[PDB]
Coordinates of C-alpha atoms in Angstrom, one line a residue:
Chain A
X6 CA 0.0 0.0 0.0
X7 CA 1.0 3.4 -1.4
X8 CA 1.8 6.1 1.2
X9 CA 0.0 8.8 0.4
X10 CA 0.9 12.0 2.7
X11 CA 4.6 12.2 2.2
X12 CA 6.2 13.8 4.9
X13 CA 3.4 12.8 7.6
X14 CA 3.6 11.3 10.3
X15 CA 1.9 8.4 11.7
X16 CA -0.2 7.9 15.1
X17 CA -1.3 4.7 16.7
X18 CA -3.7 6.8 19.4
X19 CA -5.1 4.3 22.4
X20 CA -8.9 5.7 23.8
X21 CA -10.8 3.6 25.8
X22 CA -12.8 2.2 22.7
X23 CA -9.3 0.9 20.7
X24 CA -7.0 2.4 19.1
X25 CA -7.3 5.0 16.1
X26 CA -4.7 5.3 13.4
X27 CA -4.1 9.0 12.2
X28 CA -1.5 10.0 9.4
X29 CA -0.5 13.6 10.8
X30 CA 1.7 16.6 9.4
X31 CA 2.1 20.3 9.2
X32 CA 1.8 22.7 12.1
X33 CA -0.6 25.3 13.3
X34 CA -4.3 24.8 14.7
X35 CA -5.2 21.4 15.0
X36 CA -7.8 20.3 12.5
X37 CA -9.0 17.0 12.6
X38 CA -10.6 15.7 9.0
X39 CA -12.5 12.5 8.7
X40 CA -13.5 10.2 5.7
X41 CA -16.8 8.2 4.9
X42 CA -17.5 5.3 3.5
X43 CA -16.3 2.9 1.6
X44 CA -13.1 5.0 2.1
X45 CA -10.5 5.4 4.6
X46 CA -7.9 8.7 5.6
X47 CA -6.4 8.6 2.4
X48 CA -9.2 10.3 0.6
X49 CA -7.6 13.4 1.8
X50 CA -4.3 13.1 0.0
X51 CA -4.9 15.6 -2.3
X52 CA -6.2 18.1 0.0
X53 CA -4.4 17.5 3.3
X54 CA -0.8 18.8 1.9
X55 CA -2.2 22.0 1.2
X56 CA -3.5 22.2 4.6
X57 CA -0.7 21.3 6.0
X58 CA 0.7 24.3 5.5
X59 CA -1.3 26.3 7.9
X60 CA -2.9 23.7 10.4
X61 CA -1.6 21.1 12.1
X62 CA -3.7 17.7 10.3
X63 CA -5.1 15.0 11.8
X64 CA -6.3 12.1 9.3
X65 CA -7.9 9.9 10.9
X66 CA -9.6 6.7 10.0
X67 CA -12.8 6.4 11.9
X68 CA -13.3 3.9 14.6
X69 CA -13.6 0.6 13.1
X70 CA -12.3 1.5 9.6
X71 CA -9.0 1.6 7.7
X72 CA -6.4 0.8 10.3
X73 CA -8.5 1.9 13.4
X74 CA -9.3 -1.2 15.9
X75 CA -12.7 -2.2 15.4
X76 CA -14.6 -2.2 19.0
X77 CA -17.1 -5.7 19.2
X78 CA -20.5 -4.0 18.5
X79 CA -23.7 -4.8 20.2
X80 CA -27.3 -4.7 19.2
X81 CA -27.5 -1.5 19.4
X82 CA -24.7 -0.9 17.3
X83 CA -23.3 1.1 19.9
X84 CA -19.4 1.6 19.1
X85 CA -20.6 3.0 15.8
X86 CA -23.4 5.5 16.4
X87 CA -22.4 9.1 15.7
X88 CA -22.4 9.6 18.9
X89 CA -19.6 7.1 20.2
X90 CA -17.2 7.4 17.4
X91 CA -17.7 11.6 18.3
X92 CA -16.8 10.6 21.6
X93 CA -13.6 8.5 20.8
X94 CA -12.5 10.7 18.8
X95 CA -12.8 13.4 21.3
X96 CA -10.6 11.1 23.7
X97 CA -7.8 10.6 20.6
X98 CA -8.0 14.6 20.2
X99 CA -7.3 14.5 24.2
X100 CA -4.6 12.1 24.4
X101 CA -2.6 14.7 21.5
X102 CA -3.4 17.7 23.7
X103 CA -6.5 19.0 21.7
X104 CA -9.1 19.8 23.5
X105 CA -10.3 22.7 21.6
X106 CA -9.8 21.8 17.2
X107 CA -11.3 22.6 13.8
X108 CA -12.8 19.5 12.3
X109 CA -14.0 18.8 8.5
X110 CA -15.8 15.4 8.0
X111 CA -16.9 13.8 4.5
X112 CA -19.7 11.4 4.4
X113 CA -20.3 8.9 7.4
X114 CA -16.9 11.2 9.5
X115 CA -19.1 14.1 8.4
X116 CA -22.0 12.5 10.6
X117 CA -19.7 12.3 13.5
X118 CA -18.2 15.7 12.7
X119 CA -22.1 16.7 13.1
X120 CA -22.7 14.7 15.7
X121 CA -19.7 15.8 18.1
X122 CA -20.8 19.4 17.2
X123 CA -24.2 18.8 18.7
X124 CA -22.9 16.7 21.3
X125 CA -19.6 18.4 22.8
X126 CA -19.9 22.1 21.1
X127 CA -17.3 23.3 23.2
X128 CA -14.7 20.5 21.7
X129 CA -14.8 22.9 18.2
X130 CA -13.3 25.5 17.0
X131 CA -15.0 25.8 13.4
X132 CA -17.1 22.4 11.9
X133 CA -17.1 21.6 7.8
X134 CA -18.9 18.6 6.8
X135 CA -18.9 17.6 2.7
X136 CA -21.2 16.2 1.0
X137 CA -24.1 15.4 3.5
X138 CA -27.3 16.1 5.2
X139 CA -27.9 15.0 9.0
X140 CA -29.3 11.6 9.1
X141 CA -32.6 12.6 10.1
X142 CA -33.4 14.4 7.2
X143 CA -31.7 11.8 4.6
X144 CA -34.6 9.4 6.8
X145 CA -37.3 12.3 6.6
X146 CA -37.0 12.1 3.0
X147 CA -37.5 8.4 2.2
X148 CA -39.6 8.4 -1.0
X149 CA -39.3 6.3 -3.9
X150 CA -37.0 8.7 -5.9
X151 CA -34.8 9.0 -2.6
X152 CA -35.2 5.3 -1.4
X153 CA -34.1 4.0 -5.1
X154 CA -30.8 6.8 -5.1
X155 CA -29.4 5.4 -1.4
X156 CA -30.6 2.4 -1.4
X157 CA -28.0 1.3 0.4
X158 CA -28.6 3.1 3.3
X159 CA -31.5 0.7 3.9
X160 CA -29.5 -2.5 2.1
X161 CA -26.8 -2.2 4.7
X162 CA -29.3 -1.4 7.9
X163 CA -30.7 -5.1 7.3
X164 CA -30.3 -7.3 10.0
X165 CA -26.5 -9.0 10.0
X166 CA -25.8 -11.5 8.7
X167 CA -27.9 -10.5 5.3
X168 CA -25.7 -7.3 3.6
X169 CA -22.4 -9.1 5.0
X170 CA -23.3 -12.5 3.2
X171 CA -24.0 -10.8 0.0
X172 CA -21.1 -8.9 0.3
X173 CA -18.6 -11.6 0.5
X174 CA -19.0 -13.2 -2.8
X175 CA -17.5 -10.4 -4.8
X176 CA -16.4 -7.4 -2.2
X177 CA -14.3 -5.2 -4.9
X178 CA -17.0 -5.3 -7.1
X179 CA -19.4 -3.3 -4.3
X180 CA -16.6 -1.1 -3.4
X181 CA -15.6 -0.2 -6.8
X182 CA -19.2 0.2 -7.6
X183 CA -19.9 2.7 -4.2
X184 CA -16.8 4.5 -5.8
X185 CA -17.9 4.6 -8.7
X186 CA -21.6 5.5 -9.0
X187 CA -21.2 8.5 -6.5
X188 CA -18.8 10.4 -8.8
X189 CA -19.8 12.8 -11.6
X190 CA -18.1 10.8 -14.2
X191 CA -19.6 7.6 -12.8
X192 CA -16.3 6.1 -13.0
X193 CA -13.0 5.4 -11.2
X194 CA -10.8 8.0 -13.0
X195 CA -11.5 10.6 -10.4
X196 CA -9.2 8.7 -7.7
X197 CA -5.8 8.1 -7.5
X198 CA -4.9 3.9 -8.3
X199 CA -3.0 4.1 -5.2
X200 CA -5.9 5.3 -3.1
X201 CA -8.3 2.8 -5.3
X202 CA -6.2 -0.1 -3.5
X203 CA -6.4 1.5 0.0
X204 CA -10.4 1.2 -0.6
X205 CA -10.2 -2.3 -1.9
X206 CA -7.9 -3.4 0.3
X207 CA -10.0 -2.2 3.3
X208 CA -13.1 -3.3 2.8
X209 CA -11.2 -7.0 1.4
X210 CA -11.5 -8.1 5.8
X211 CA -15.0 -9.6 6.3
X212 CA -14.8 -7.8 10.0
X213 CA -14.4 -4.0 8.1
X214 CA -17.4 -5.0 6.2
X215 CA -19.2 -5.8 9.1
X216 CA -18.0 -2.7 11.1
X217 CA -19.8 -0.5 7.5
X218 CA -23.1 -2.5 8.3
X219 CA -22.6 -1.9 11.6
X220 CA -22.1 2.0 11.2
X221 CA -25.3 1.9 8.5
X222 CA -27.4 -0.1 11.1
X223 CA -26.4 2.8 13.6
X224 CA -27.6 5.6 10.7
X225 CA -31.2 3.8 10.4
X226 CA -32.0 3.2 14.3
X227 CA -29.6 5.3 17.3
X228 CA -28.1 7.8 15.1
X229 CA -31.5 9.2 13.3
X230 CA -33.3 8.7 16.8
X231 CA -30.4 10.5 18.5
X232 CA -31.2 13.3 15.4
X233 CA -34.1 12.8 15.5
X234 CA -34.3 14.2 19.5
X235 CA -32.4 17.1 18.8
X236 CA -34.5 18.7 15.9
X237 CA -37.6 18.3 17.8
X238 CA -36.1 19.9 20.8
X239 CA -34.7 22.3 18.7
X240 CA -31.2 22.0 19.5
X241 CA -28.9 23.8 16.9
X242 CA -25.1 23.6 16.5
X243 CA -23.8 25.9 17.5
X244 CA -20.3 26.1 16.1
X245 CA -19.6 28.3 12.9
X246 CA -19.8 25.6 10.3
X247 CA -19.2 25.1 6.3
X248 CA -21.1 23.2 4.3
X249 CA -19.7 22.3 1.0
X250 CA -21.9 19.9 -1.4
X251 CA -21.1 18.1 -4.6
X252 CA -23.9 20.0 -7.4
X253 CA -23.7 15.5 -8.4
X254 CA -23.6 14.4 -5.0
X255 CA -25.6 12.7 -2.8
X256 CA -26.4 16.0 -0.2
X257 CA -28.3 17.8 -2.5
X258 CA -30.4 14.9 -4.5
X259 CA -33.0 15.0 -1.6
X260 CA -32.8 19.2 -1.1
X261 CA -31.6 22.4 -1.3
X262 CA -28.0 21.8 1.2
X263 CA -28.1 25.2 2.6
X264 CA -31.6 25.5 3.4
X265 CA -31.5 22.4 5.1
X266 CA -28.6 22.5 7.7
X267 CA -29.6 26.5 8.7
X268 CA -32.2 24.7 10.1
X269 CA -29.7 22.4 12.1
X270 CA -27.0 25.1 12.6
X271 CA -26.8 28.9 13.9
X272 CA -24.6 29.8 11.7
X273 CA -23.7 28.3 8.5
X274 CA -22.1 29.5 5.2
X275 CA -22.2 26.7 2.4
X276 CA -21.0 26.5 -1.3
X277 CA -21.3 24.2 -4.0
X278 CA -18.5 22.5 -5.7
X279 CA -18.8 20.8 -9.5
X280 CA -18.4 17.5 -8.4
X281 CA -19.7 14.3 -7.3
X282 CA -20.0 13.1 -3.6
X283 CA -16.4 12.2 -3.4
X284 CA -15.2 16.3 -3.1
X285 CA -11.9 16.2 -1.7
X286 CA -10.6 13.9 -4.4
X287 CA -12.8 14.8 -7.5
X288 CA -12.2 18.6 -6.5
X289 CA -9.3 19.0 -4.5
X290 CA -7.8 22.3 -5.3
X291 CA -11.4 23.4 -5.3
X292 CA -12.4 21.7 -2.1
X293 CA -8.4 22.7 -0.5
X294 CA -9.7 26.7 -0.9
X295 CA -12.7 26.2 0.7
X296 CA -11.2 24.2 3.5
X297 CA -8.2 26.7 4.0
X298 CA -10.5 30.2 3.4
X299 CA -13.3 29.2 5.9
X300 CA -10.7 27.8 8.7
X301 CA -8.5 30.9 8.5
Chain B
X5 CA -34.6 -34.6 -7.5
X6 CA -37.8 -31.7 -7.0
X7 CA -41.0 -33.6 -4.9
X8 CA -44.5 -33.9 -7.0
X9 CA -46.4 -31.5 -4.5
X10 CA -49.8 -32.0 -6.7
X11 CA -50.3 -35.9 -6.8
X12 CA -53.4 -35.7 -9.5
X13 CA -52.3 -32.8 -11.2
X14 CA -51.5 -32.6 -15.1
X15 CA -48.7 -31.0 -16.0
X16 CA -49.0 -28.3 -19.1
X17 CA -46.9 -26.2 -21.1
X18 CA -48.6 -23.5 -22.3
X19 CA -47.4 -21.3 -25.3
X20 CA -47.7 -18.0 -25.8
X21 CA -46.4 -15.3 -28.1
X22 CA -43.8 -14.6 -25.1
X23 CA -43.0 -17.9 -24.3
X24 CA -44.2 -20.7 -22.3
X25 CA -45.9 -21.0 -19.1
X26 CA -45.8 -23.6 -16.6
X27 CA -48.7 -25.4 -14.9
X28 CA -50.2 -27.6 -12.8
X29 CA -53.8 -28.2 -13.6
X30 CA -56.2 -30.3 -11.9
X31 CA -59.5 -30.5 -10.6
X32 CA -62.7 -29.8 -12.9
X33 CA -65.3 -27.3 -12.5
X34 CA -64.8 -23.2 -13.1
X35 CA -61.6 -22.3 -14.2
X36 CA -59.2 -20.8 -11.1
X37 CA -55.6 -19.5 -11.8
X38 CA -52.9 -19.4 -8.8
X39 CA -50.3 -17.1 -9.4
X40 CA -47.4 -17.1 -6.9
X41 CA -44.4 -14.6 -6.6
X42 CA -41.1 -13.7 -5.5
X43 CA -38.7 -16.2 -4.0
X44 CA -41.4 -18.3 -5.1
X45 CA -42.8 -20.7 -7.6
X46 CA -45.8 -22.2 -8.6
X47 CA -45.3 -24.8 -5.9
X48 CA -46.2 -22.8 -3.1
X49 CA -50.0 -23.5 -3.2
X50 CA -49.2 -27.5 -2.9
X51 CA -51.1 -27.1 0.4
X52 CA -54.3 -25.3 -0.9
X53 CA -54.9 -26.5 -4.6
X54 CA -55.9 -29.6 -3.6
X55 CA -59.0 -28.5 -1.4
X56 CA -59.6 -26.0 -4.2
X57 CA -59.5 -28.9 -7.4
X58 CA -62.6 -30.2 -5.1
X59 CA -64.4 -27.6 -6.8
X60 CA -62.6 -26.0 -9.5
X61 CA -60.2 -26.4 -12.4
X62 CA -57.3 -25.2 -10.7
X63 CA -54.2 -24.0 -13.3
X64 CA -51.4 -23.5 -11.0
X65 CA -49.2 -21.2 -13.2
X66 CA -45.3 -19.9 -12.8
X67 CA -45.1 -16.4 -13.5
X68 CA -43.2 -15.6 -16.8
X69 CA -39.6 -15.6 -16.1
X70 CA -40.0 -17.4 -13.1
X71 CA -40.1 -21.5 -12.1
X72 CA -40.2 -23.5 -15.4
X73 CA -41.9 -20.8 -17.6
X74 CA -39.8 -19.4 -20.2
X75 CA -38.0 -16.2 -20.0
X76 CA -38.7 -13.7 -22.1
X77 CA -36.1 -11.0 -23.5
X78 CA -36.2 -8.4 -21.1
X79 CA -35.4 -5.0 -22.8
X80 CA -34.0 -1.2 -20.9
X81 CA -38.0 -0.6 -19.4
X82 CA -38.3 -4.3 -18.3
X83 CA -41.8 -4.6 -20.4
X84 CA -41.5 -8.3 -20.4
X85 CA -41.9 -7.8 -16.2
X86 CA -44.3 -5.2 -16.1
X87 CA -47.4 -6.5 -14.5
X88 CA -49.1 -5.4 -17.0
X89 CA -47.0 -7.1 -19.8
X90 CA -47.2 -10.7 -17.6
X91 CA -50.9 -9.7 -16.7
X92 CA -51.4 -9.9 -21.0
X93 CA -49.1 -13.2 -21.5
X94 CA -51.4 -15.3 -18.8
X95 CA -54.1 -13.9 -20.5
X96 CA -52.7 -15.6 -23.7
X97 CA -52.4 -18.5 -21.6
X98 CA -55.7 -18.7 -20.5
X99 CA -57.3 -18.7 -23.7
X100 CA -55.3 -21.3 -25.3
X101 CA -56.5 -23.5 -22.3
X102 CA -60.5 -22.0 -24.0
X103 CA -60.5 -19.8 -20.7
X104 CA -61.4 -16.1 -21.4
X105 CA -63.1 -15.6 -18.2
X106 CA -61.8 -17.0 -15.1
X107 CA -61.3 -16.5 -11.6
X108 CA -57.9 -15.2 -9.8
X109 CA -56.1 -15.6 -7.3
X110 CA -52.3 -14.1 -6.5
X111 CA -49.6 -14.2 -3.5
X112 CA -47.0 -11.1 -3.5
X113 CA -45.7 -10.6 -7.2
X114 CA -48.6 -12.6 -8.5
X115 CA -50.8 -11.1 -6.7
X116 CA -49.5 -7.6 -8.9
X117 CA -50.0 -9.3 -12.4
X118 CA -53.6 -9.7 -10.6
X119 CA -54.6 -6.6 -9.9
X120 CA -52.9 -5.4 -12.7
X121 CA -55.0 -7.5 -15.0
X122 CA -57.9 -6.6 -13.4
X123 CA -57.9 -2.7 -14.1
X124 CA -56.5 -3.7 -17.5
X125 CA -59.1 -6.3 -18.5
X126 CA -62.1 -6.6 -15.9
X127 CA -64.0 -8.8 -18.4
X128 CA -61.8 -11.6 -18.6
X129 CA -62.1 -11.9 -14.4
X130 CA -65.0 -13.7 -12.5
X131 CA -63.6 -12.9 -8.9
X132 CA -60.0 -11.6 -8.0
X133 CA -58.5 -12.9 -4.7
X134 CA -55.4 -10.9 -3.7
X135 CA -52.8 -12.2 -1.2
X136 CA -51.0 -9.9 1.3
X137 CA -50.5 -7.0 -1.1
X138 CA -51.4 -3.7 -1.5
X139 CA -50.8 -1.9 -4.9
X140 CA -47.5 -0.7 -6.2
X141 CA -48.5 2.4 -6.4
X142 CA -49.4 2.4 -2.0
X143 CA -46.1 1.0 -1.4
X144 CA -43.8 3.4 -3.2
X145 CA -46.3 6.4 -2.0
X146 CA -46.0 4.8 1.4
X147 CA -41.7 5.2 1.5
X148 CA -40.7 6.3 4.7
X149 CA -38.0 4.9 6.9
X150 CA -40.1 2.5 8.4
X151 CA -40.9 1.4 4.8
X152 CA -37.2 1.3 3.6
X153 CA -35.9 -0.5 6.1
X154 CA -39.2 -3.4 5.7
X155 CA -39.2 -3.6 2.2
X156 CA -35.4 -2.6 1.2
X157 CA -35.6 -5.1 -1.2
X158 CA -38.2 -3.4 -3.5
X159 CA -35.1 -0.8 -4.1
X160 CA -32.3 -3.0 -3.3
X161 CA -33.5 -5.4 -6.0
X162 CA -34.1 -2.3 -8.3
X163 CA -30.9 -1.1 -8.9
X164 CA -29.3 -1.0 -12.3
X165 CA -27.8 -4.2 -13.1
X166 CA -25.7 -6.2 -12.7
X167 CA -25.5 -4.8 -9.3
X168 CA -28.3 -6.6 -7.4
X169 CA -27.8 -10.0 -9.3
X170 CA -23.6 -9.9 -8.6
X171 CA -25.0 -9.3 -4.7
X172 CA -27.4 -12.4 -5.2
X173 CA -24.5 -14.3 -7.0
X174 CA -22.5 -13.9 -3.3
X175 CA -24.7 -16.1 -1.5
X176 CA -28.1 -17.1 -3.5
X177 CA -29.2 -20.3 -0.8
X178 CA -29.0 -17.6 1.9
X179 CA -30.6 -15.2 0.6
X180 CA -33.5 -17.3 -0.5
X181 CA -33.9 -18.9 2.6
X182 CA -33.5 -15.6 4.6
X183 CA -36.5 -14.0 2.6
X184 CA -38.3 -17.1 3.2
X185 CA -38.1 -17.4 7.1
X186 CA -37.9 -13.9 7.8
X187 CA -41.1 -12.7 6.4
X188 CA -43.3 -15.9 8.2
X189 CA -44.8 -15.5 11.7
X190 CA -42.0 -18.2 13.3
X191 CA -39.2 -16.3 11.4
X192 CA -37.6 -19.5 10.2
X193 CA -38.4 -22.1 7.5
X194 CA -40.5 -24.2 9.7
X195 CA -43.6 -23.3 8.3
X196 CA -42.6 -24.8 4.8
X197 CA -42.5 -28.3 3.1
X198 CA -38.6 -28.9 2.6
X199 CA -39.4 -30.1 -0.7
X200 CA -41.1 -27.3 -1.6
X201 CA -38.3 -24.8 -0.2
X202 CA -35.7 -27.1 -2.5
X203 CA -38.1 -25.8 -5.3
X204 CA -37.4 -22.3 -4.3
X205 CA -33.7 -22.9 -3.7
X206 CA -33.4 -24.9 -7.2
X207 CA -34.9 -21.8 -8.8
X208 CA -33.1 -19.1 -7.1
X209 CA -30.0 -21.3 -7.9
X210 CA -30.2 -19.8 -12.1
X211 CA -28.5 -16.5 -12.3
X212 CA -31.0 -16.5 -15.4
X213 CA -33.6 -16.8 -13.1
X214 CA -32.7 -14.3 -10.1
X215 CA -31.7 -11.7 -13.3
X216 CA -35.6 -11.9 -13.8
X217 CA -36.8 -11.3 -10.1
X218 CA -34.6 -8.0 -10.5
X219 CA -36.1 -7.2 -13.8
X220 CA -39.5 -7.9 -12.0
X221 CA -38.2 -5.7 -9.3
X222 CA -37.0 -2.8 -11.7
X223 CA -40.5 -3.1 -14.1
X224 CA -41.8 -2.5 -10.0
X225 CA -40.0 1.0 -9.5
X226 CA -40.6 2.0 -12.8
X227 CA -43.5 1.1 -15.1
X228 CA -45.6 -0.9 -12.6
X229 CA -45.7 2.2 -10.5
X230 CA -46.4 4.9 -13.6
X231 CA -49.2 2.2 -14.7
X232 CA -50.7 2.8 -11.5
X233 CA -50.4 6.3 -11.3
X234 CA -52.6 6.7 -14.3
X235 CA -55.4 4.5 -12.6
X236 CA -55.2 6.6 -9.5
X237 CA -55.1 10.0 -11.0
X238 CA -58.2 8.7 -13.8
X239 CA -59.8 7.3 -10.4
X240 CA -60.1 4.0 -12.3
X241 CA -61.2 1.2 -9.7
X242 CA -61.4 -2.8 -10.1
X243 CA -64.9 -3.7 -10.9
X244 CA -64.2 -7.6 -10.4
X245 CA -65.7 -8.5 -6.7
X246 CA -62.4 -8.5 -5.0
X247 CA -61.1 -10.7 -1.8
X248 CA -58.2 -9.5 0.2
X249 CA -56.4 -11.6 2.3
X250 CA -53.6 -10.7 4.5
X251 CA -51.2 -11.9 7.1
X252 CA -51.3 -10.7 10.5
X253 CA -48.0 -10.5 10.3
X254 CA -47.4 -10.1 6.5
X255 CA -46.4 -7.5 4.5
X256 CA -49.7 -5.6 3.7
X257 CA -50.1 -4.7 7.2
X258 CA -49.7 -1.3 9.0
X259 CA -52.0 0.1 11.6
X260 CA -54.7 1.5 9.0
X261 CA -55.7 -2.2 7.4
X262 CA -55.4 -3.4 3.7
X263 CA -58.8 -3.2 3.4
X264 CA -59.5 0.5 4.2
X265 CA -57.0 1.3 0.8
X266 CA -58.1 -1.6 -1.1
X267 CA -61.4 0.4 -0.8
X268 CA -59.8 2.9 -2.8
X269 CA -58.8 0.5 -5.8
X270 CA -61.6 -1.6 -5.8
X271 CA -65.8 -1.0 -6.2
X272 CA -66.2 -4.4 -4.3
X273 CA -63.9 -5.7 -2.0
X274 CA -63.9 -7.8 1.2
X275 CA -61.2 -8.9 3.1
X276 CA -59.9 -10.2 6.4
X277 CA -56.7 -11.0 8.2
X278 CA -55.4 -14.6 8.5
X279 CA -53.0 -15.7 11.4
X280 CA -50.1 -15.7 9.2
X281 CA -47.2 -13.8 8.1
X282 CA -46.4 -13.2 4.6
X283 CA -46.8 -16.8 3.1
X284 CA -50.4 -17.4 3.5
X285 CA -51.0 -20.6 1.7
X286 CA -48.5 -22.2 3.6
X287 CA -48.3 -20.8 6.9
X288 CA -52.1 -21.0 7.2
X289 CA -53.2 -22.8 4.7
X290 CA -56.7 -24.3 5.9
X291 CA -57.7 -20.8 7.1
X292 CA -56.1 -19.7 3.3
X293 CA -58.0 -22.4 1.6
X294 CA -61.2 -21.7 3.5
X295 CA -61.6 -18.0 2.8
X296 CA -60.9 -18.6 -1.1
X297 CA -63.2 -21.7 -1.6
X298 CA -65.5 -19.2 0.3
X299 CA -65.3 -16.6 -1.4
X300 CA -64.9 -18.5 -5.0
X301 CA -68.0 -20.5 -4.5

């Protein structure tokens, strides 16, 4: 496996729920950036350099994922609600020294980056999330135009062991085929090979598959009902947040981004980027300026 | 080897313009047509055809594509799958048996064709019998979470090929028996004749086969759905005195009743729920048998 972030370092961080790996360079404010799925930290090779030159970066994979340990779920799907991986990764930012950091999340890390900002405000410094809507409102909007486009959100909620049995005849086909349909080409050329084979390779382990069900599972039950509390009560974030969205991704197939999240946060600037879901590697430069202009 | 599950029955090919259809046929009387659906094959009504050949001629069909029927072509809308395109092939069918006027009755996909046929061509129907479904048009206008997460496979089994039959392709005996036991009442397969469940496993065994289901699947999200539309939006109704059966546990079920929308689809239409889940002929099949002979007679 290639390594992607020349020049970075690498962190095996202990928390109470295992251990999560981190690739981490340049100096400045921390900022911690997370992936989604059916990725790992290396989707931010092309625009974690150029942060690097202001902030100090942390890539991490998300609990469960990539090199990350993989806590033994339950039936709640516990170590992989929103909410827990917020809170180990709270505990990694801790055990660095940062208790106070910018985070950017894409996809599923963007649901924990959402999530810890609800959860832990005072843990943030500024939030950017890429690419998504909270969970609820994915859920709130589950008609047949919507329930065809994710499909999978419902395919890999299904009880274990259905999604992980279908999944193991033929696992780089699915990942190659999440890669692929997502991006605005609807093909692979968007990523780098290297980074391809990071994918495949990661969800090649029967147990990471699992851990992806398990995280889905989490978004159709604990994380939407965990949502699902906070805009009935009415609890906005309150952390000065981005929200950047693909004008092909998946954010903005089921509303208008921006509308949406000023009703989940108090103070939110947004932008569109040509591109599919997969922004930071479809539009890096684009997605890089965005990044470094709102955290400065 | 695949168990006889109709001692006494014939066995028929039936051509049509589209291919040919599979049946049992036995008994003597009115005409009847069974038409199963999805994991399914004819052979689920081994456990209520008989009591029905006691008073009818019972055809016990598989669906085009499905069983030992021929598949037909499919082409980029799935027309050979619409319900309305199968709906026109039994009719074929039935009148090469001399049957232009018959009575009906479907489980799940067959159950689709039914209907379908029904609002498409009343005429040919005496009585329409529908098995723990409501219309395609109510489940996709139903999609919520709870929905999604029930019936994922109505858009799971949607998607563009060949990605839903190279996920079936990873483990097709699972996945047949998991949609087999998890939509009963005792959530396993005990409420099935293992000879009948090697039928379903046989057929779910043909990629050619499960390739099918998903185009039956895909004409469901698509043309199935816009054929419906129309008949909602022109307000057209089934005229066909109408029996609605469904599991207490089946699929049909929410807390507002199949009947109450089957009201809305149908001029004449009774109904009532059977201790069952999804699989009424055989998880309850006396209590299946008696409402149809019932309501057939």
């Amino acid at each position: 496996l290639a390594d992607l972030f020349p020049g970075f370092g690498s962190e095996w961080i202990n928390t109470s729920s295992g251990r999560i790996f981190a690739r981490v360079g340049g100096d400045g404010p921390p900022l911690l950036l997370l992936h989604g799925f059916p990725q790992t930290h290396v989707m931010w090779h092309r625009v974690a350099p150029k942060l690097a030159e202001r902030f100090k970066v942390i890539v991490a994979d998300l609990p469960g994922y990539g090199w990350s340990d993989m806590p033994e779920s339950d039936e709640q799907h516990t170590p992989y609600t929103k909410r827990a991986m917020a809170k180990q990764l709270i505990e990694a930012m801790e055990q660095l020294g940062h208790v106070h950091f910018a985070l950017a999340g894409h996809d599923r890390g963007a649901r924990v980056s959402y999530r810890l900002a609800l959860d832990s405000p005072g843990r943030l410094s500024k939030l950017a999330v890429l690419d998504i809507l909270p969970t609820y409102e994915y859920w709130q909007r589950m008609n047949r135009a919507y329930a065809l486009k994710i499909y999978h959100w419902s395919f890999l909620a299904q009880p274990a062991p259905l999604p992980e049995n279908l999944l193991g005849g033929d696992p780089d086909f699915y990942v190659k085929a999440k890669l692929a349909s997502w991006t605005r080409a609807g093909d692979l050329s968007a990523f780098d090979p290297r980074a391809v084979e990071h994918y495949r390779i990661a969800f090649a382990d029967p147990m990471r598959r699992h851990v992806m069900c398990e995280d889905y599972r989490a978004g159709a039950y604990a994380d939407f009902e965990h949502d699902k509390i906070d805009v009935e009560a009415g609890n906005k974030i309150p952390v000065p947040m981005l929200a950047l969205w693909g004008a092909s991704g998946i954010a903005q197939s089921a509303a208008t981004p921006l509308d949406v999240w000023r009703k989940w946060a108090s103070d939110v600037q947004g932008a569109p980027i040509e591109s599919g879901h997969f922004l930071p590697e479809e539009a890096p430069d684009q997605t890089a300026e965005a990044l470094v202009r709102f955290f400065s």
